[PDB]
Write a protein that binds this ligand. Structure first.
Ligand SMILES: O=S(=O)(c1ccccc1)N(Cc1ccc(Oc2ccccc2)cc1)c1ccc(C(O)(C(F)(F)F)C(F)(F)F)cc1
Length: 274
């Protein structure tokens, strides 16, 4: 079954998640909002986001934003300031998650920074899948809601952008909170990240989290639908890392044309300021 050590690993991760995941986004406030040539062509990477924004007030008021269509203009950058603020809020939560976990704290500062930089996007996306509604194509973030706008091919066309397909595929697995936090742990403690000194310790931690995840699934999911779940999750994690490397390249190209990264995002991506 589950060993007490395995049950102590899950509890440590689960408590770290509860303390640092504001699932209602109640402290996300004071954020920016959109106002009331091969480089540029590629930089039209932005069209795959296609998101509408809803902001519900406590008074009952609802503000709704619909994005501009591309007209060969700067209007494509209208939502980047808001998204940078949301990304920064999510990343701060992820940093707090790592810092409250005993195993991460024990690691050297240099390794802690290297691991956070490598896994920050992946951990944020894993948390965002918990708030994603597959039926509505919407990410429900407290009073903010982010809805995918209609596209010609509809669902299938959205499933062509890897980030979106990841979200739909992961949600279909119908994971428990314990399985999400183990995926975060496996992704955070990745030994093959640039700059990791204590690779052997990190690799052993990762294997223990994966063993714990495999054991959790074996003990709590006996149904033929959950056959090969551990391996599906591990493949998902491998795809997320490829998505992460692609997203980094897309982001840095936009930044090069149209700077928008916040200070914390600049630190994450090694932008110096000079
Ligand atoms: O993948 S989503 O859900 C998404 C959102 C909208 C349309 C399609 C897909 N996402 C949310 C998200 C937020 C944070 C994150 O982790 C990061 C951690 C540190 C630094 C950067 C990211 C990962 C996903 C999303 C949000 C923004 C972006 C951007 O590339 C954008 F803005 F240039 F499109 C940018 F620049 F803001 F990061 C991409 C995906």
């Amino acid at each position: 079954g589950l060993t007490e050590e395995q049950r102590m690993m899950i509890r440590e991760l689960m408590d770290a998640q509860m303390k640092t995941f504001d699932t209602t986004f109640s402290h996300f406030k004071n954020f920016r909002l959109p106002g009331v040539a091969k480089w540029s062509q590629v930089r039209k990477d932005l069209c795959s986001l296609k998101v509408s924004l809803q902001l519900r007030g406590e008074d009952g008021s609802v503000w709704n934003y619909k994005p501009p269509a591309d007209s060969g203009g700067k209007e494509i950058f209208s939502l980047l300031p808001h998204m940078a603020d949301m990304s920064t809020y999510m990343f701060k939560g992820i940093i707090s998650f790592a810092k409250v976990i005993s195993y991460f704290r024990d690691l050297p500062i240099e390794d802690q920074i290297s691991l956070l930089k490598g896994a920050a996007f992946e951990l944020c996306q894993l948390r965002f899948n918990t708030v994603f509604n597959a039926e509505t194509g919407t990410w429900e973030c407290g009073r903010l809601s982010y809805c995918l706008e209609d596209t010609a091919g509809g669902f299938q066309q959205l499933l062509l952008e890897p980030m979106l397909k990841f979200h739909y595929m992961l949600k279909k697995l119908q994971l428990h909170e314990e399985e999400y936090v183990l995926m975060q742990a496996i992704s955070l403690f990745s030994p093959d990240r640039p700059g990791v000194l204590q690779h052997r310790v990190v690799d052993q931690l990762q294997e223990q989290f994966a063993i714990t995840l495999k054991s959790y699934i074996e003990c709590n999911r006996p149904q033929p639908a959950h056959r090969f779940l551990f391996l599906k999750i591990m493949a998902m994690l491998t795809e997320l890392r490829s998505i992460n490397a692609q997203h980094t390249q897309r982001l840095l190209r936009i930044q090069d044309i149209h700077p928008f990264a916040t200070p914390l995002m600049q630190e994450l991506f090694g932008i110096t300021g000079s």
